[PDB]
Write a protein that binds this ligand. Sequence first.
Ligand SMILES: COC1=C(OC)C(=O)C(C/C=C(\C)CC/C=C(\C)CC/C=C(\C)CC/C=C(\C)CC/C=C(\C)CC/C=C(\C)CC/C=C(\C)CCC=C(C)C)=C(C)C1=O
Length: 219
Amino acid sequence: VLPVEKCNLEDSACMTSAFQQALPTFVAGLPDHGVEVMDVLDLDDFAFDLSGLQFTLKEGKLKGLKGAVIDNVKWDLKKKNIEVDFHLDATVKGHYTAGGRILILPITGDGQMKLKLKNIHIHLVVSYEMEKDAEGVDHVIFKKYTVTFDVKDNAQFGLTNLFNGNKELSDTMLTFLNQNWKQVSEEFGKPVMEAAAKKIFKNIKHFLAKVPIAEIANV
Ligand SMILES: COC1=C(OC)C(=O)C(C/C=C(\C)CC/C=C(\C)CC/C=C(\C)CC/C=C(\C)CC/C=C(\C)CC/C=C(\C)CC/C=C(\C)CCC=C(C)C)=C(C)C1=O
């Protein structure tokens, strides 16, 4: 199904390489297997209300996951956790709305978004159980995850139709977001990441649940 060389789980050099070879095929999607495309990833509609900003995103897209570099995969067979560190550049797009304020500036907006995130580092931890199925085939079954993020290099904000078309105000806001990009990544990044992470997690869990572990590991 997926092109992956078989590792011992505690050989982290190997696992980091296997994840790296699998990832692009995987994120392309596996229609017949019930695995959605994850680059470009369709994010489900969401909203958030945080630190004075009422935000929504519709027709959400996350681009970039097909080019992620896996930094390390640490498998702890004792605790039955997997730690996966990786980084990428990502673009988040869609029909956004904004009201309230961002930090010290009031905002209104109803238009299109293009967020370009450069060298975002992600720290994923998954909990899993090994589970034999009804016909006796052992599977890795994902149970929970945590994900943290750190945008190290830069984040760029493209927001159309801010301030009902007023250039002056839109220009001031856009300059403002790019100058304080880090702060803004830390204030509002979590709900965005979570929109992607829950969908990505669903599909990995679905996939691993159905593919025998012996097909993708030395167990
Ligand atoms: C070795 O055997 C194998 C396994 O073990 C058995 C495997 O598990 C697997 C797994 C299969 C593959 C390796 C695929 C693995 C997949 C992996 C590691 C991907 C995991 C991805 C995670 C679940 C989620 C990642 C999430 C992201 C990239 C999203 C990040 C986005 C972020 C942080 C957005 C940040 C946003 C901001 C900074 C600004 C936000 C602000 C605003 C929107 C508001 C702006 C202000 C207003 C005005 C608009 C394989 C292949 C295998 O072979």
